[PDB]
Every structure is written in structure tokens, then in C-alpha cells.
Amino acid sequence: NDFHRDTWAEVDLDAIYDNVENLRRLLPDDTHIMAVVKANAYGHGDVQVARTALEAGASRLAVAFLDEALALREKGIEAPILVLGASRPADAALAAQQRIALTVFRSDWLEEASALYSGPFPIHFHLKMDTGMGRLGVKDEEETKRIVALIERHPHFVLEGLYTHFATADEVNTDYFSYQYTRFLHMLEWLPSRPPLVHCANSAASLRFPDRTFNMVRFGIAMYGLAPSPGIKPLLPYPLKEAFSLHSRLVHVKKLQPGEKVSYGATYTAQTEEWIGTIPIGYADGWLRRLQHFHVLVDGQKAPIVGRICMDQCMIRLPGPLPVGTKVTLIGRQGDEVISIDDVARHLETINYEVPCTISYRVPRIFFRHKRIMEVRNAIGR
Amino acid sequence: NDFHRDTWAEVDLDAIYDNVENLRRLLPDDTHIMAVVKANAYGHGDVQVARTALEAGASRLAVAFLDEALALREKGIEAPILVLGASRPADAALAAQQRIALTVFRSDWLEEASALYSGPFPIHFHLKMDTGMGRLGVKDEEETKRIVALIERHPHFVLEGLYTHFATADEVNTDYFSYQYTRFLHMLEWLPSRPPLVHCANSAASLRFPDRTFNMVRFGIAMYGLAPSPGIKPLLPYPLKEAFSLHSRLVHVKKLQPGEKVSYGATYTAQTEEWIGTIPIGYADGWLRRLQHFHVLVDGQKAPIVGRICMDQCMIRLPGPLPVGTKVTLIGRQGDEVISIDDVARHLETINYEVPCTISYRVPRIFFRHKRIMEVRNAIGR
Ligand SMILES: Cc1ncc(COP(=O)(O)O)c(CN[C@H](C)C(=O)O)c1O
Ligand SMILES: Cc1ncc(COP(=O)(O)O)c(CN[C@H](C)C(=O)O)c1O
Numbered sequence: 001n002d003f004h005r006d007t008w009a010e011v012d013l014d015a016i017y018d019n020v021e022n023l024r025r026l027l028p029d030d031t032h033i034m035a036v037v038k039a040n041a042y043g044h045g046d047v048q049v050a051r052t053a054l055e056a057g058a059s060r061l062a063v064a065f066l067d068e069a070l071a072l073r074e075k076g077i078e079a080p081i082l083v084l085g086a087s088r089p090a091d092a093a094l095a096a097q098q099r100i101a102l103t104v105f106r107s108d109w110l111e112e113a114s115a116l117y118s119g120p121f122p123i124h125f126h127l128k129m130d131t132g133m134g135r136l137g138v139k140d141e142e143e144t145k146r147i148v149a150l151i152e153r154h155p156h157f158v159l160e161g162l163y164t165h166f167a168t169a170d171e172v173n174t175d176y177f178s179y180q181y182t183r184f185l186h187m188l189e190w191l192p193s194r195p196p197l198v199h200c201a202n203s204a205a206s207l208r209f210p211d212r213t214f215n216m217v218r219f220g221i222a223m224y225g226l227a228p229s230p231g232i233k234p235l236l237p238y239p240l241k242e243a244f245s246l247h248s249r250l251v252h253v254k255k256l257q258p259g260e261k262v263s264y265g266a267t268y269t270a271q272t273e274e275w276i277g278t279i280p281i282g283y284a285d286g287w288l289r290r291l292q293h294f295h296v297l298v299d300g301q302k303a304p305i306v307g308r309i310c311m312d313q314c315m316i317r318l319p320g321p322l323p324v325g326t327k328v329t330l331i332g333r334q335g336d337e338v339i340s341i342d343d344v345a346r347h348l349e350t351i352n353y354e355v356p357c358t359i360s361y362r363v364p365r366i367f368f369r370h371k372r373i374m375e376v377r378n379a380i381g382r
Numbered sequence: 383n384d385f386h387r388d389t390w391a392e393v394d395l396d397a398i399y400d401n402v403e404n405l406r407r408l409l410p411d412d413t414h415i416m417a418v419v420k421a422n423a424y425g426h427g428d429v430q431v432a433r434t435a436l437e438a439g440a441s442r443l444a445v446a447f448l449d450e451a452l453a454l455r456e457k458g459i460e461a462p463i464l465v466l467g468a469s470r471p472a473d474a475a476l477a478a479q480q481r482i483a484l485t486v487f488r489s490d491w492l493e494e495a496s497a498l499y500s501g502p503f504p505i506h507f508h509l510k511m512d513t514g515m516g517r518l519g520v521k522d523e524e525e526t527k528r529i530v531a532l533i534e535r536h537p538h539f540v541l542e543g544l545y546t547h548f549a550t551a552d553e554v555n556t557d558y559f560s561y562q563y564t565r566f567l568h569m570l571e572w573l574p575s576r577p578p579l580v581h582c583a584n585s586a587a588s589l590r591f592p593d594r595t596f597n598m599v600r601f602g603i604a605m606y607g608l609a610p611s612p613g614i615k616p617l618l619p620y621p622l623k624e625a626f627s628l629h630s631r632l633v634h635v636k637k638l639q640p641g642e643k644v645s646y647g648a649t650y651t652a653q654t655e656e657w658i659g660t661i662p663i664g665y666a667d668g669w670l671r672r673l674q675h676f677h678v679l680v681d682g683q684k685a686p687i688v689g690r691i692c693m694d695q696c697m698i699r700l701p702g703p704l705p706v707g708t709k710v711t712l713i714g715r716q717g718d719e720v721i722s723i724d725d726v727a728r729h730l731e732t733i734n735y736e737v738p739c740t741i742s743y744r745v746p747r748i749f750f751r752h753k754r755i756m757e758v759r760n761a762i763g764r
Binding site for chain 1: 385386387388420421422424425446447448449450452453456466467468469470473476487488490512514515516517518521549550553558633634636638642643644645646647648650658660662665666668670671672689692693694695697706731732733735736739740742743744760761762763764
């Protein structure tokens with residue numbers, strides 16, 4: 001893949017490999033690692049991360065919905081994939097045909113799938129139990145037993161596993177977390193027999209209580225080198241390696257006289273003679289307008305974004321006259337300076353999770369592995 | 383194209399067609415309309431909108447950078463295309479080969495392209511002049527005259543047009559706008575001869591002062607049925623037809639008991655027995671966490687999002703028990719209720735421009751024309 005705009009993200013797959021391999025060491029040899037690669041691998045590239053994770057010790061993959069699993073299959077992934085979200089009963093055969101496990105939490109969903117699917121491929125289901133997140137999952141025993149029976153009844157339906165998800169595993173206080181964990185052990189008692197795969201832990205839960213993970217953990221945010229929360233940062237077993245960086249280059253440089261305005265609404269006025277540089281990145285690239293008072297790195301120093309951010313471009317105040325083509329780092333490091341995803345998240349008043357997911361399809365991803373450029377991924381490429 | 387999650391955006395091409403035809407009527411017959419379809423047509427589907435705009439009266443198209451023009455070419459667009467932003471001198475030949483016009487604002491860029499391009503295809507350039515926006519464009523006569531000469535010297539370099547862009551055309555007070563407009567007429571004098579294409583007006587400027595547009599206008603935001611700003615809303619010559627709407631469906635429905643918590647951080651607590659619905663859309667789809675206290679439309683009534691929004695899902699309080707599969711509208715209308723992009727923009731504290739662009743590649747676009755589904759566009763499809 002090739003691209004024609006000097007703006008690109010870089011994904012360090014060696015970082016991703018180390019983050020996963022280190023967990024593989026920390027976990028019991030009997031414990032599976034399921035790599036969560038939904039939302040294009042949290043904006044890092046679905047197939048590239050999936051392969052590296054499998055390479056580092058992950059044995060299974062997880063996506064948000066069916067479309068995300070089929071895409072991985074088409075790209076050549078043959079590892080098992082679990083759809084964590086909802087799916088249509090009418091798509092059961094497709095999922096069964098492609099060897100994709102489905103999450104189930106409603107007995108009426110199964111009644112539908114049953115009437116539509118007869119075989120010959122078996123469907124692996126994972127029972128979701130709501131223990132306090134309030135998102136998806138069964139809540140009562142009656143509904144739970146009903147589901148187990150329907151699966152039991154059908155020759156091609158198999159209950160491969162069951163799980164829950166924690167709402168506060170990244171909180172230093174573990175009161176709610178303990179309630180959910182206890183609720184889980186109680187509900188597992190509703191099952192006639194324990195499925196071969198029992199899971200509940202996410203990045204935070206598996207890194208904090210690796211002994212309470214059962215047979216499989218679902219590794220997400222931490223695989224990308226980002227802490228589930230600033231609060232638990234000082235409690236993580238090993239150092240995480242940030243894998244995502246974002247860069248651009250100056251395409252224009254000019255000197256403004258005092259009084260000259262910049263950008264929409266003319267909300268910025270040069271106080272004195274200053275050098276303004278224009279970079280080819282805007283909010284359609286995920287660099288939201290709310291980043292208007294943030295700073296970028298240029299020539300090793302912090303340069304403030306001046307004026308409002310445009311759809312495809314934005315201006316910054318430079319230290320002096322720098323040459324067009326000069327590299328600008330928006331996320332990453334230059335010399336001694338560095339800007340992490342956590343820094344961007346803080347200014348945007350959101351969590352790190354949301355930042356890389358928002359860097360759009362317009363921004364090509366360049367992959368590094370073994371300290372070398374592996375491949376380029378340009379969504380709007382040829 | 384097909385999709386397997388019950389979440390999709392709908393683009394009404396009839397609206398797009400009407401918004402453009404109405405301008406074609408308002409402008410002098412000698413004035414060209416160049417449809418701005420960068421950022422995948424402001425998130426509406428680049429080729430689908432481009433074809434409709436050309437059908438309605440547009441004669442040319444504009445994109446942000448080269449990659450966007452190439453894609454339109456691959457997808458079968460033959461109409462003239464202008465790249466509004468920066469491009470590499472080394473890509474001049476590729477542009478010339480594909481009949482793509484380029485914006486130029488530096489003489490040193492031309493020096494480079496000259497040395498690298500010899501023909502036989504001619505390159506059509508549009509000279510960008512900075513009149514107060516502070517983004518791109520020449521600022522002085524010396525640099526201007528220099529660019530004209532270089533273009534003149536090369537046999538395959540053609541100066542097809544020259545333009546500027548306004549920073550405050552959507553402001554009721556036209557003080558800065560007049561200065562810019564006046565600056566433009568002054569700088570145009572620097573040109574030995576007027577290029578066949580002089581342009582400066584965007585949506586706001588062309589709708590307010592269609593008599594000051596010259597030979598071509600660059601129609602963007604208004605083409606999608608969105609007002610350049612709320613301030614000029616009452617000054618628009620004709621009613622704009624919103625083309626974008628966003629929907630999903632309930633994938634889970636349950637009753638919470640007083641005291642039960644919902645979502646991350648367990649920030650939401652059921653006060654009484656209530657019905658919570660779960661929908662398959664989250665922040666990786668562009669439904670940013672900041673919309674946490676907003677509402678959606680369900681069964682014709684407003685339903686408040688409860689708890690934090692997740693990457694792929696969120697919860698809403700329901701009037702009562704509704705059947706799973708019930709349609710939810712996030713942007714659009716249901717019965718008497720409606721949610722416009724302007725409403726979402728207000729809650730997110732940004733402008734309408736930014737909202738459709740942020741609805742990600744994960745959300746399929748369903749196109750309507752003549753009141754019938756035209757096609758489906760799933761970015762992560764097969
Ligand atoms: C050079 C140029 N011409 C024409 C337009 C169309 O403007 P409008 O959508 O308001 O009609 C734009 C706006 N672009 C995006 C919005 C920007 O700079 O943020 C532009 O940059
Ligand atoms: C069911 C499920 N399992 C596992 C994970 C991985 O969590 P983490 O990234 O914290 O390790 C998630 C989180 N998803 C996204 C983040 C959400 O719900 O917003 C999940 O939904």
C-alpha cells in the first residue's frame with residue numbers, strides 16, 4: 001500500500017508482541033489468552049495485531065460483531081474467533097460455516113436459531129452472564145436453565161463456554177469488583193456442568209488478579225500498551241509498551257505580522273511577528289476540534305495549535321522558520337519530548353481507549369516489526 | 383454489500399440532489415458549481431454523493447488530498463477534480479495522468495515539479511491566495527509573480543484558476559468577510575491575466591452573496607442539508623434538506639431492580655424498577671462518550687442514554703418492555719420527535735461538520751434515491 005498525504009500513524013508490533021508475551025509468562029500455563037481485536041484492533045489494524053498476538057501466545061481472538069470476524073477470516077486468520085456482541089439468529093449458519101463462536105444471553109434467540117439451523121456444522125456458543133455491568137447477559141436461573149436445555153437439545157449447538165464482564169476492575173477500590181466476582185461463582189452454580197471455557201477477566205482484572213482468571217482471559221487495552229486507568233498504573237505487574245504514534249509534516253510555513261488572524265472565526269491573532277506552520281491533519285482524521293489548545297511536537301519542542309482545527313488541516317505556532325517537510329509528531333516522541341495517548345485523552349476529557357479508535361480510516365497505518373517497516377495499510381488506497 | 387449488525391446510517395440522495403439543484407437555480411447560469419466531497423463526502427459516501435451532485439448541476443468536484451481524488455477515479459468518476467490541500471511534487475505526473483487539478487501556493491514546490499515532470503500530459507494548477515484565513519496560499523506579489531512565471535515557462539504547466547477561502551462567511555457581521563473579499567480583488571491584480579476560473583465562495587458565501595461568486599463556487603456543507611452556522615440559518619435563500627440519519631435496534635431488553643448499577647464505573651443506579659435497553663453502537667462507531675447524557679428516539683419518544691457509553695454498545699432507559707429488534711433512531715425522526723445533527727453537535731459542543739465525519743467506517747451507509755434503497759456500502763464488508 002502507498003499513500004499521498006504526509007500524515008500517518010505508526011504501529012509498533014514489537015510492542016504489542018511484548019505486551020502479550022509478558023502476560024503469557026504471568027499466567028498459568030493452563031490459561032488461554034484471547035486477544036480482543038474489535039474496532040480494527042482499537043484502531044491499530046485488525047489482521048496485523050491478530051497475527052502478532054497469536055505469535056506471542058494468544059490462542060483465540062475476540063471481535064465486537066459478525067462483520068469484524070468475517071473480515072479477519074477473509075484476510076486469512078484461521079484462529080478461533082468469538083463474537084462478543086449480539087448477532088442475528090439468521091446468521092447462525094454463516095457463523096457456523098466460518099468457525100465463529102457466538103455470544104448468547106436470551107432463550108428466545110435460540111428458539112429462533114433452532115428453527116432456522118439444522119446443520120451440518122456445529123455452532124459454538126458462549127453464554128454471557130450479567131453480574132453487574134448491566135450491558136448483556138442472563139440475570140436469572142430460569143432463563144439460564146432454559147438456554148442450556150435448548151443448546152442440549154440441538155445436535156449442532158454446543159456450549160463451549162460462559163462468561164461475564166467487570167464494570168469496575170480498573171478501580172483501586174475493589175468493592176463492586178468483589179460483588180461481581182462473587183455473583184459469578186454463584187451463577188456458575190446454575191449450570192448443570194462447567195463448560196470447557198470459563199472467563200471473566202479483561203486487561204485490568206487479569207493483570208491485577210491473575211489467579212482469579214479461570215481458563216481464559218480477554219486481553220484488550222493493555223495489549224496495545226495502554227493502562228486500563230491511571231489509577232491502576234502503579235499496580236501493573238510489568239511495564240506496558242505504547243504501540244501507537246501519529247505524525248505529519250509541515251506543508252506550509254509563513255511569518256505573520258502582528259494583528260493578522262488565523263483560521264475560522266478568526267479566533268486567533270498574532271501578537272507579534274510569528275512563524276506559522278500548516279499541517280495536513282484535521283477532525284475528519286480524528287484530530288477533533290476540541291484539541292484546539294493542545295500542542296504538538298516539532299523539532300523536539302512543543303508547538304501550540306493556534307486557531308480552530310479544520311477538517312483536513314490545522315496550524316501551529318513554530319519556534320522559528322522551519323523547512324517545509326519538517327516532521328511533526330502529534331502522538332509519540334521527539335528527542336526528549338513525548339505526547340502519549342493519555343495526554344491527548346486528558347485534554348479531550350475522555351479515556352485513552354477512545355483516542356486510537358477515533359483516528360480515522362483516512363490515516364494510513366505503517367507497521368513496524370523487528371525494528372523494520374513491515375507493511376503499510378492505507379484504507380482509501382487503490 | 384451486506385452487513386451483520388443492526389446499526390446503520392441512511393443517506394437520502396434525493397435531499398442531496400434537491401439542495402444542489404436549488405443552488406443551480408439561484409446562481410447565474412455562467413457560474414459553475416464544484417461539489418466538495420472530501421472526507422468521503424463529509425461522511426456521506428464519496429462516489430454516491432459525487433454522482434448525484436453532478437446529476438443535479440455540479441460540473442466539478444473537490445477533495446482534500448490526492449488519495450481522495452484517485453479513489454473517485456478508480457470508482458469511475460470522470461468529472462474534473464481539484465485537490466484543495468497540499469500534494470508532493472513527485473506526484474505531479476500521477477495527477478497529470480489522472481486529470482486531477484492541483485492547488486499551488488509556493489514557488490519552491492513548482493521548482494521541484496518542473497525538474498521532475500516533462501510531459502506529455504498537462505497539469506492544471508489552481509493558485510491559492512491567502513486573504514485572511516492563514517491556512518494556505520500566497521501572501522505577497524513577489525511570490526505570486528514568481529509562481530506565474532514558472533507555470534508560464536513549463537509547456538505542460540497550466541494555470542487554470544486561482545482562489546481564496548473565507549474564514550468568517552458564516553458570521554452575520556460581514557466586517558472580516560469584506561476585508562478578505564477586498565483583499566482578493568487587490569491580489570487578483572497581481573496576475574498578468576485572469577485565469578479562466580476565479581473562485582472564493584463556500585456554502586455560506588455563495589448562498590448569501592451569489593452575486594459575488596465569480597465563475598465557480600465550492601459547495602460543501604449546505605449540499606448535505608446542514609447550515610454553515612446557526613447564525614445564518616434565518617438568512618438562507620431556501621430550506622436545506624438534511625440527508626443524514628442514524629439508526630440501530632434493541633438487542634437486549636431487561637428490567638432492573640432499584641439499586642442495580644449500569645455500565646463502566648457503575649456510575650448509573652436504577653432508582654426504581656425500570657426497563658433498560660441495549661443497543662449495538664458505541665464510541666468506535668463515532669458515538670463518542672461525551673454523548674453520555676443525551677437521548678435517543680425509541681417508539682416515537684425520547685429515551686435517555688444511561689451510564690457510560692462503551693466502545694460498541696450503550697444502554698438507554700425504555701418507556702416499558704419493548705420487543706428486542708425495536709428500531710432506535712439516534713439522528714433522524716420518529717413520529718413527531720426528531721434529533722438533528724445540530725442537536726448532537728450542540729451536546730458534543732462542536733459544529734455539525736464534525737458529526738457525520740466521525741461516524742466511522744464501521745457503520746454501513748444505505749443509500750436512498752427516488753424513495754427506494756439504491757445501494758448499501760459496508761466498509762468492513764466482504
Ligand atoms: C478550500 C475550501 N473550499 C471550500 C470548502 C467548502 O466549505 P463549506 O463546507 O463550508 O461549504 C472548504 C471547507 N473545508 C472544511 C469544512 C474545513 O476547512 O474545515 C474548503 O477548505
Ligand atoms: C466483553 C468484553 N470483554 C473484554 C474486553 C476487553 O477489555 P479491556 O480493553 O479493558 O481489556 C471488553 C471491552 N470492550 C470495550 C473497551 C467497551 O466495552 O467499551 C469487552 O466488551
